[PDB]
Design a protein around this ligand. Structure first.
Ligand code: CL
Lengths: 328, 318
């Protein structure tokens, strides 16, 4: 009932059915606590991912605006850029990508394999830059040039994280609440917290459908201090677009991303190895592996509110496994 | 329905209209998205494993053994399933193409095998898969384990039941004139053969071969077709159609027509095919239009059997 204004936003149909919400009996056995998993990694478009949920709203907005070109930005190994390019091809829209090498690697699989390989399969126009120091400003300059060629560009921010994009995860929260109804009482939810639209959309939805559930974001690029205002700003903007208040505090753990965004760490790689070997589930070195490492240590250090069921949001990211191998 | 089966997929996989590709080819093309399954990046082999692994549990196995190329999709899917169910996995692998390219040897499906904690046994060649798997099962059994052997490509009568099931989904989900599928170890072809004869008999089913000529491959598809039919107490009289022009110079080697099929589907539809199987099968479908090989001019159904992780293994070359 309280999420009905969500209906007013046009959206494309990229996913179809709700994504699986599954129990992880072997991980749970190992961790000594019930772990469930929301499989947003399993979507029908170009190897899937959370970003596709945001693109349903973003691209429908682009179509409504008469745009014929999608322009966005990210790392060379961005999942968002890859999903945006797959969607662009499918719809006969052009796609322009402003890419950066965030970790300064020269490893060939990072530079040419994984998500970056797929971009060429999608005929993505690639614009390289030294660094995304000011993505909104750099994306505009790029739009101006694209426009001078006669294209009608729609600019999507980094990670698809705008209030509109984040509606996709307000929607995901609705699925989660329905799937858990009379099946399991969730105590905590864990998701990776990057550009912040996924966290923020979950925050609004869960506040209204599942107010007792504790939502934890595991940062993948930022400290709590840098990250929290970004999540909050989106949270509030989302709530307003829906004519809702959002009074929930935002929780973030920043202990699991060192040495930095896009750099693998030992605990993140152990997390990937653990989910693959115990559950046949594929995480990634950049996002989900670090988030899972966060979940695992949280159980270990008693960081959660209690001993009840945890839901891990699988946001995707697996194509990056191939780019990060063998190293850097 | 007599055969016990594990639920790895659940919902029917999507069946879609490809309007951009259709527009380009001047023909109606549909796709069966069996590449979209929830387990370890998906694929057709998963449909087979629903039956083979159910069979394995019934016999109280604790270890699954199968064989394939280093970049085998089946082995990767078997290993993920094994990991999920708490079974050991032993894989017999060969290098079918004599490559030393780092990505073929260590990336793609092969990388996933390590993540899934697969035990790896290398052999010069899978000249006698049935017998080599048998030897492996013995040495594994003599170590205190209880092995269950899964054939190459998961292709046996039991395995192929997975594709009688897909045929039902196709029937439910569908003026279809033709169906195109890659024909390798043959369980998929033969499973769709049985299911489609009994549900869509007017539909022409074409297997595009990926490893063999029509002469070498037809008996394999037939043997399996007849076996599947017997097990379901049916008779299958429909003949097997195969095109073998699209796989040169051999199994697991990409060709230009297949790679350009991957490019066309990526750029037109945002769909990802692979260099070994579906790309080649799609090139056959396209050339089937070019040379008017199909029975008529009506809608074509392409079966996306999967294979995409091999894109990362085959890049940049060899
Ligand atoms: Cl334990």
């Amino acid at each position: 009932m309280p999420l009905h204004h969500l209906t007013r936003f046009p959206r494309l149909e990229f996913i179809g059915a709700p994504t699986p919400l599954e129990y992880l009996p072997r991980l749970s056995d190992y961790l000594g606590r019930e772990i469930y998993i929301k499989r947003d990694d399993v979507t029908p478009i170009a190897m899937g991912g959370n970003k596709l949920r945001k693109l349903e709203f973003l691209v429908a907005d682009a179509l409504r605006e008469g745009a014929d070109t999608l322009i966005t930005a990210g790392a060379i190994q961005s999942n968002h850029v890859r999903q945006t390019a797959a969607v662009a091809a499918k719809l006969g829209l052009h796609c322009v990508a402003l890419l950066e090498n965030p970790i300064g690697t020269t490893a060939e699989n990072y530079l040419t394999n994984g998500n970056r390989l797929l971009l060429d399969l999608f005929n993505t126009q690639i614009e390289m830059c030294d660094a995304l120091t000011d993505p909104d400003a750099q994306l505009q300059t790029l739009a101006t040039r694209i426009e001078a060629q006669g294209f009608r560009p729609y600019v999507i921010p980094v990670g698809g994280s705008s209030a509109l994009g984040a509606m996709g995860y307000v929607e995901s929260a609705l699925e989660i609440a329905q799937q858990c109804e009379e099946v399991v009482g969730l105590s905590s939810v864990v998701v990776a917290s990057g550009s912040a639209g996924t966290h923020a959309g979950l925050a609004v939805g869960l506040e209204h459908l599942m107010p007792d559930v504790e939502l934890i974001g595991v940062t993948v690029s930022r400290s709590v201090a840098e990250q929290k205002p970004k999540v909050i700003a989106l949270q509030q903007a989302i709530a307003g677009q829906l004519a809702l208040t959002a009074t929930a505090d935002i929780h973030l753990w920043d202990d699991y991303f060192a040495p930095g965004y896009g750099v693998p760490n030992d605990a993140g790689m152990e997390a990937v190895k653990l989910l693959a070997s115990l559950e046949g589930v594929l995480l990634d070195p950049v996002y989900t592996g670090k988030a899972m490492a966060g979940l695992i240590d949280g159980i270990s250090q008693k960081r959660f509110n209690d001993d009840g069921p945890i839901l891990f949001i699988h946001t995707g990211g697996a194509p990056a496994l191939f780019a990060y191998h063998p190293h850097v």
